[PDB]
């Protein structure tokens, strides 16, 4: 059985600068800020925590 | 999978939305509480984790009187607590207090909620917006939204339902202004703008049906079914289906020309219906009749450029073909020179759904004709003239320049609606 | 109920050791066993007579229609 | 035309001020119930009737001797109201005394019985003096000044020359009577700058001070001998919706009421509560059983109370519908439960001893329909909103509501015996057919023929069709199984009730033309045409389950026993004053029960098995 | 709770201009009093809480002790008038290692001390009305090696005068602050 993670809790707070960009071509993530200047110590351990989720709008943001 | 987010900006939007959402709740059996006592709901609703199909819509109106009614009524459970958004004061029939002042205060909450509603979608196929040109929210806040969604969902089509300034009958004295100033900032952002006045639908309620003293309620329910008919192919099964994108690519010619109309077909009352056959031929021809259109603009005073006969119910594909052939012959209905076909069709094998407590009857067939006529220039020229008359003696312009809006904007808007007029002329001319 | 003497002291002796001051070894424990037309329905929502959802009543009654108006074709109006 | 028997009466018109009264013999209550005034016995089911009056009575006035009882009715504006004297010992009309145009608000007798003050009319307000000896007028004057407004109250004193009126506009005026010159002489009482709106008067037993109950929640005590104020009411914690009843005791105390039911016994100087008990409904009458140990309080939501002074413990002795009651229906099998159905309320009652067991109130709303499903698991109701509410038989919870059922109200309703279908009428003239599932309440068909409005649904014994009386002169036998019609029964009357004769081959129809007529279910032809009541129209019928007797009531305020095969009449009446709306044979063929335009539930011992 | 709220650049939990400012707040008054009105320099209503005991009378932003408001905004700014008396206030935060942690600022404390469930620090008020900016994301980092998640409580003690207790996304200068958030 899975446990709710910090990737979920940081999402409805809105800390992630992401939105599910709906391409007709596919599902990409639109980034409101540059990926290069992101704090990698805050986001990589947090985006890896979202792998455990299987519901669509959260597992896609972890995968992509 | 194929979902569409519906946004209701302005008293109208909400009022018409309280009618459109009622119908959806019935077609896809979802009781007011939000419970279904298989996948058609996706297009409009979204299941939680306990049969709480919650609407995929956003209701926004600065003044908290129309959304508070929803919050304290039948569909208090259906709509998500935070999907209904309000402010404090109103735009007081002033574009400025919706696109420059109060609007700004609510644009970053309305937008954030659309994002959340779009991030849970798997195939956003369009953003339907229910606005009312006359008001300051249905012209100002809707401009902010369409001027924002464009810089956030460029590809995503943005269809737009709109109660248009009725020929003579009108409520506010500044409606002329709001409309012109809002087309300037919505013509370059919307994909196609479905237009419905109020004079016409009032008549259709008295004559075609039998309702003396028709109110907004009645009007909103017929507009509600036009939406059901357009979105039916995306949620029920059919023989020739038509998705949101397929509307624009077969209805919008020269980019700017994007102002289609809307006519239902079996708008008959109970007593009358029984005594009638309502065949594909009849309902089809009834749609082209210049007294069933819902935007008083004498179809005969112009040329159709791209009709879209979207049907629903028992419609044998053969009868359809025949029916449309007849229409092509009759010369009263004249098409242009650069549109040989101009007849995108569509059949959805789902009989019209009777709103328990409406005025329409149990017809087992219907057609929704979305036509791109070049007669809407007449209506556009009327509003254009009204502006001039008032702007000449800078009438209610002090109110507009106080909430943020240079007098220049008025001039650009006028010169841009003039371009719309010129364009429609250079689209009716022959080769 | 009690399996042994510790639970007899631990159970509902009604002796608060914070509050009980200068008791005796008898009042150290005081067990609880020692001590001892019309059905009215109100609808929650309270609406108004001027918020009825429906068609609006003609001031002329249906059988008469004293303000006798018709359509352009002269049809009836029902209701 | 043998009279049956009139056992038991539920009903009280609490909307009048100064209603429920107890004559000084201390053994019978007196209260108004329409254009009649009842005499209910204390400690005995015995009750009698004072007939007379054309329209609804607004006043009662009983004497200190008890020998004379007077009353006063409303009428259409421009027409003359009638003040009817009576004798309590023989209950018979002895005066008509018609002077006041419009209506009446208040009556009071002289201490020893020889004059009557009968101030009458928001249209023609003018105080008059009557004679109890000559049955004739004596004096007359306008009861209010031209600067001030209109007066609605009267009282006498301990000397028969004073007559005192208050107003809803402040006309506190102590008059004096001048027989030789045949005139009255007023004197406005100065009260400082306290202009108030007051609706109740009581005086002390030793003629000291008169007491007022204002709308502000303030007891005004003033002097009739110096024409001045003496003491204002509660300084802080004032009363609710204005004091609508005051009754000064033999002591220096006073039982002060309220528009909420806060009956308070307070003393003179502070007007501060001593013993408070909350009554349901706004207090409209505070009587005294003579000496004052058992004072009976009446309320506008008509509930007669019984309070002992020395403990202030109540006993609800009477409970009534305070508005017009329509549709009485019985549960299947048993005959000891009612469905008394009115504006703002739905009630059930025990037949043998009249006592309500459930009250179902949907705010300020009206229910023109009620029905009981065969399983006895839902009381189906038809409300004015357009929603078919189905309450539960016990508790009273709303099991389901059918939102937007009909446009202009749902008037007539009926369930089916299979407990799956509720046939619904409408004020727009539509017959809807709903399906009652375990979780859904859907629509199956919208059958629309009737133009005006539907009046009465009736369903047969084994469900295949239903008859729907309508206000446009049509009664259709709709085919319920195949969702169509079968008949086009037509007449020139506004139909108001239809019933299925057992062994269904013919239907009995009623209406406005009083032409009670058997109609066949095949070919829809006239069968008989009986004459109803010679006075008005017929609202309501019920045929017994043996098809030998159908009962009838109408605008003619009168229950009518009619056997079937021959059209002879076994008429009874002498019932209640108020338009009989519906009537229902008991399932056990043991009582017949009729409702009326004024809230009244009558039971008659049904003859003729 | 404040969880479904967007929590934008501004969020106010108490503002003295309104019908019931202390609606979500819980009032505990003991040998003191609470009032709402005095115009000394700004001609506006400012809430007063003061009493002879500073640690006993106070106001707490979540009324129910089980409920906690969740605000992700790192900067915590209140506008408090100096009264030259004892004033303290609380803030309780949730940490990334899931520890209920508290901070205290006081007028009557000489030196600061940090240890695991309470960090108490001194404070010097100005002469009159001032605003103070309690950077929660930095005080949860200097005091303990910890990141900020969300606050849970704020509590304001006696001998102070209160207007516009609010959170902010980041520190704002006086000019870019909007008109309804200004000191004057
Ligand atoms: N068809 C239809 N039109 C409506 C309805 N309600 C409002 N309208 C139209 O809305 C126009 C004016 O806009 P408003 O109703 O004031 O709504 P708004 O856009 O929020 O304007 P403000 O509240 O002043 O900012 C009127 O001219 C009406 O034609 C409705 O229920 N049905
Ligand atoms: Mg508005």
């Amino acid at each position: 059985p899975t446990k709710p993670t910090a990737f979920r809790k940081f999402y409805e707070r809105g800390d992630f600068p992401i939105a599910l960009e709906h391409d007709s071509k596919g599902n990409k993530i639109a980034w409101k800020v540059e990926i290069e200047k992101l704090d990698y110590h805050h986001y990589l351990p947090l985006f890896f925590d979202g792998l455990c989720e299987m519901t669509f709008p959260y597992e896609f943001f972890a995968r992509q | 999978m194929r979902e569409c987010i519906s946004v209701h900006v302005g008293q109208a939007g909400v009022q018409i939305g309280n009618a459109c959402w009622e119908l959806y709740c019935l077609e896809h059996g979802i009781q007011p509480d939000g419970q279904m006592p298989d996948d058609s709901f996706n297009t409009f609703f979204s299941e939680t984790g306990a049969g709480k199909h919650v609407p995929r819509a956003v209701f926004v109106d600065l003044e908290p009187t129309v959304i508070d009614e929803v919050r304290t009524g039948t569909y208090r459970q259906l709509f998500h607590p935070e999907q209904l958004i309000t402010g404090k004061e109103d735009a007081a029939n002033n574009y400025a207090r919706g696109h420059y002042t109060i609007g700004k205060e609510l644009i970053d909450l309305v937008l954030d909620r659309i994002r959340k509603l779009a991030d849970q979608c798997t195939g956003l196929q369009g953003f339907l917006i229910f606005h009312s040109f006359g008001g300051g929210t249905g012209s100002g806040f809707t401009s902010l939204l369409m001027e924002r969604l464009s810089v956030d969902y460029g590809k995503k089509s943005k269809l737009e339902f709109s109660i248009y300034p009725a020929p003579q009958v009108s409520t506010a004295v500044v409606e002329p202004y709001n409309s012109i100033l809002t087309t300037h900032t919505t013509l370059e952002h919307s994909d196609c703008a479905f237009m419905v006045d109020n004079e016409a639908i009032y008549d259709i309620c008295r004559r075609n049906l039998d309702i003396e003293r028709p109110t907004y309620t009645n009007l909103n329910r017929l507009i509600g079914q036009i939406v059901s008919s357009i979105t039916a192919s995306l949620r029920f099964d059919g023989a020739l289906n038509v998705d949101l994108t397929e509307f624009q690519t077969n209805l919008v010619p020269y980019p700017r020309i994007h102002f289609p109309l809307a006519t239902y077909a079996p708008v008959i009352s109970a007593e009358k219906a029984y005594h009638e056959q309502l065949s594909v031929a009849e309902i089809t021809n009834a749609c082209f009749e210049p007294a069933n259109q819902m935007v008083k603009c004498d179809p005969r005073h112009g040329k159709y450029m791209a009709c879209c006969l979207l049907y629903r119910g028992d419609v044998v594909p053969k009868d359809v073909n025949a029916a449309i052939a007849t229409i092509k012959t009759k010369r009263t209905i004249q098409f242009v020179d650069w549109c040989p076909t101009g007849f995108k069709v569509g059949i959805n094998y789902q009989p019209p759904t009777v709103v328990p407590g409406g005025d329409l009857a149990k017809v087992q067939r219907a057609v929704c004709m979305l036509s791109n006529t070049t007669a809407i220039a007449e209506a556009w020229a009327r509003l254009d003239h009204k502006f001039d008359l008032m702007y000449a003696k800078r009438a209610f312009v002090h109110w507009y320049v106080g909430e943020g809006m240079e007098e220049g904007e008025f001039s650009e808007a006028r010169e841009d609606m003039a371009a719309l007029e010129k364009d429609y002329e250079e689209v009716g001319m022959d080769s | 109920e009690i399996p042994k003497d510790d639970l007899d002291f631990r159970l509902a002796a009604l002796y608060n050791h914070h509050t009980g001051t200068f008791k005796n070894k008898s009042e150290i424990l005081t067990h609880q066993e020692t001590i001892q037309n019309i059905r009215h329905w109100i609808n929650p929502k309270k609406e108004s007579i001027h918020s009825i959802q429906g068609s609006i009543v003609s001031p002329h009654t249906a059988a008469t229609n004293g303000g006798y108006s018709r359509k352009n074709d002269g049809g009836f109006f029902s209701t | 035309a043998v009279e049956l028997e009139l056992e038991a009466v539920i009903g009280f018109n609490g909307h009048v001020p100064t209603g429920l009264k107890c004559h000084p013999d201390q053994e019978h209550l007196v209260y108004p119930l329409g254009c009649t005034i009842l005499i209910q016995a204390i400690n005995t089911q015995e009750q009698n009737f004072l007939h007379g009056h054309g329209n609804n009575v607004s006043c009662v006035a009983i004497s200190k001797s008890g020998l004379y009882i007077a009353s006063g009715q409303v009428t259409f504006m421009g027409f003359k109201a009638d003040i009817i004297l009576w004798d309590y010992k023989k209950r018979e009309l002895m005066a008509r005394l018609s002077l006041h145009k419009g209506k009446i608000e208040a009556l009071a007798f002289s201490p020893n019985d020889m004059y009557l003050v009968s101030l009458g009319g928001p249209d023609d307000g003018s105080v008059v003096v009557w004679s109890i000896a000559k049955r004739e007028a004596i004096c007359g004057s306008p009861a209010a000044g031209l600067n001030v407004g209109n007066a609605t109250t009267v009282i006498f004193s301990k000397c028969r020359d004073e007559m005192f009126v208050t107003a809803g506009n402040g006309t506190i005026r102590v008059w004096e009577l001048d027989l030789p010159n045949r005139k009255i002489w007023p004197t406005e009482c100065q009260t400082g700058q306290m202009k108030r709106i007051v609706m109740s008067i009581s005086m002390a037993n030793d003629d000291s001070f008169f007491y007022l109950g204002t709308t502000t929640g303030d007891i005004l005590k003033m002097n009739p001998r110096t024409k001045l104020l003496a003491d204002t009411g509660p300084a802080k914690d004032k009363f609710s919706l204005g004091v609508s009843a005051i009754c000064c005791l033999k002591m220096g105390g006073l039982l002060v009421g309220s528009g909420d039911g806060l009956l308070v016994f307070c003393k003179s100087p502070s007007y501060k509560p001593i013993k408070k008990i909350q009554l349901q409904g706004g207090i409209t009458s505070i009587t005294l059983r003579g000496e004052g140990h058992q004072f009976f309080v009446g309320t506008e939501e008509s509930h007669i109370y019984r309070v002992n002074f020395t403990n202030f413990k109540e006993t609800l002795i009477t409970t009534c519908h305070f508005e017009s009651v329509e549709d009485i229906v019985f549960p299947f099998g048993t005959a000891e439960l009612f469905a008394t159905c009115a504006k703002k309320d739905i009630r059930v009652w025990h037949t043998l001893t009249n006592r309500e067991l459930l009250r179902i109130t949907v705010p300020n709303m009206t229910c023109h329909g009620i029905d009981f499903m065969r399983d006895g698991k839902s009381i189906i109701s038809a409300w004015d909103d357009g929603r078919i509410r189905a309450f539960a038989p016990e508790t009273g919870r709303l099991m389901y509501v059918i939102n937007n059922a009909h446009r202009i109200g749902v008037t007539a309703i009926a369930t089916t015996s299979d407990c799956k279908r509720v046939i619904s009428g409408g004020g727009e003239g539509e017959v809807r057919v709903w399906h009652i599932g375990h979780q859904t309440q859907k629509l199956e068909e919208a059958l629309k023929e009737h133009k005006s409005s539907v009046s009465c649904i009736r369903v047969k014994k084994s469900n295949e069709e239903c008859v729907t009386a309508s206000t446009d002169g049509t009664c259709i036998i709709w085919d319920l199984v195949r969702l169509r019609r079968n008949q086009m029964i037509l007449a020139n009357t506004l139909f108001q009730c239809v019933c299925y004769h057992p062994e269904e081959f013919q239907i009995i129809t009623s209406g406005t033309d009083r032409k009670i007529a058997y109609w066949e279910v095949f070919d829809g032809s006239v069968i008989r045409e009986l004459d109803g009541s010679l006075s008005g129209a017929v609202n309501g019928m019920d045929i017994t389950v043996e098809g030998v007797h159908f009962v009838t009531g109408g605008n003619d305020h009168l229950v009518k026993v009619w056997d079937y095969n021959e059209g002879e009449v076994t008429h009874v009446g002498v019932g209640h004053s108020g338009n009989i709306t519906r009537i229902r044979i008991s399932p056990g063929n043991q009582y017949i029960v009729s409702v009326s335009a004024d809230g009244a539930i009558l039971r008659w011992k049904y003859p003729f098995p | 709770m404040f969880k479904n709220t967007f929590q934008s650049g501004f969020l106010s939990i108490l503002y003295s201009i309104g019908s019931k400012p202390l609606q979500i707040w819980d009032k505990k008054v003991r040998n003191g009093h609470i009032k709402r009105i005095t115009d000394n320099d700004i001609q506006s209503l400012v809430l007063e809480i003061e009493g002879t005991n500073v640690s006993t009378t106070y106001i707490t932003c979540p009324a129910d002790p089980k409920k906690t408001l969740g605000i992700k905004l790192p900067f915590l700014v209140m506008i408090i008038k100096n009264l030259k008396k004892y004033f303290t206030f609380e803030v309780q935060v949730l940490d990334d290692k899931n520890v209920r942690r508290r901070f205290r600022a006081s007028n009557y404390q000489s030196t600061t001390r940090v240890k695991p469930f309470i960090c108490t620090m001194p404070m010097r008020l100005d002469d009159g009305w001032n605003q103070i900016q309690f950077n929660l994301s930095d005080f949860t980092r200097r005091a303990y090696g910890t990141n900020y998640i969300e606050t849970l409580r704020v509590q304001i003690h006696a001998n102070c005068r209160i207007r516009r207790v609010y959170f902010s996304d980041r520190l704002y200068s006086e000019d870019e602050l909007p008109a309804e958030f200004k000191l004057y």
Side-chain angles (χ1 to χ4, degrees), chain B residues 9-17 60-63 65-66 89-94 97-98 130-141 162-166 169-172 175 178 196-198 201-202 215-221 223:
Chain B
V9 199
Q11 168 137 229
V14 183
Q15 297 214 337
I16 303 155
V60 31
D61 189 51
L62 316 166
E63 171 134 320
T65 41
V66 67
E89 229 97 332
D90 69 334
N93 288 338
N94 180 6
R97 340 194 348 120
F130 300 83
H131 85 87
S132 55
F133 287 97
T137 313
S139 79
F141 200 82
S162 56
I163 300 313
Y164 186 74
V169 159
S170 130
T171 290
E175 291 182 12
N178 294 311
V196 173
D197 72 20
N198 263 184
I201 176 140
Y202 276 139
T215 98
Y216 276 166
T217 62
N218 324 64
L219 270 46
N220 307 349
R221 290 156 95 84
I223 309 152

Side-chain angles (χ1 to χ4, degrees), chain B residues 357-420:
Chain B
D359 355 68
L360 254 89
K362 225 185 282 191
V363 272
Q364 326 285 327
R365 187 173 315 133
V367 64
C368 186
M369 190 198 60
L370 318 158
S371 43
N372 210 304
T373 195
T374 335
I376 208 55
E378 166 227 66
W380 273 125
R382 294 173 92 272
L383 258 48
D384 190 276
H385 186 38
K386 303 175 163 170
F387 208 96
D388 322 330
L389 301 152
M390 259 159 80
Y391 196 33
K393 13 232 113 46
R394 300 266 327 279
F396 294 83
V397 195
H398 69 273
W399 294 116
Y400 280 64
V401 79
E403 295 267 312
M405 167 132 48
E406 325 300 292
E407 204 216 304
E409 317 214 32
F410 273 58
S411 83
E412 321 300 277
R414 250 325 261 62
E415 92 219 5
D416 124 274
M417 211 77 30
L420 226 238

Side-chain angles (χ1 to χ4, degrees), chain E residues 110-125:
Chain E
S110 50
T111 184
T112 185
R113 60 179 69 95
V114 64
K115 62 91 175 180
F117 300 106
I118 185 54
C119 181
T120 72
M121 61 215 78
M123 182 178 71
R124 192 264 311 274
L125 276 297

Side-chain angles (χ1 to χ4, degrees), chain D residues 474-493:
Chain D
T474 66
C475 291
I476 297 169
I477 308 287
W478 317 86
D479 193 348
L480 183 63
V481 176
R482 297 285 75 78
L483 282 70
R484 292 191 297 271
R485 328 198 295 106
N486 202 5
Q487 292 301 142
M488 186 65 204
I489 289 183
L490 181 65
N492 220 321
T493 184

Side-chain angles (χ1 to χ4, degrees), chain E residues 73-75 134-142 146-148:
Chain E
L73 306 202
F75 282 78
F134 204 84
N135 194 0
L136 283 162
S137 171
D138 204 40
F139 288 152
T140 198
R141 180 138 287 283
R142 178 70 274 172
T146 302
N147 277 338
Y148 181 51

Side-chain angles (χ1 to χ4, degrees), chain C residues 9 13 23-31:
Chain C
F9 276 113
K23 314 271 161 154
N24 168 21
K25 67 182 290 294
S26 61
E27 289 84 4
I28 190 167
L29 76 164
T30 43
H31 280 302

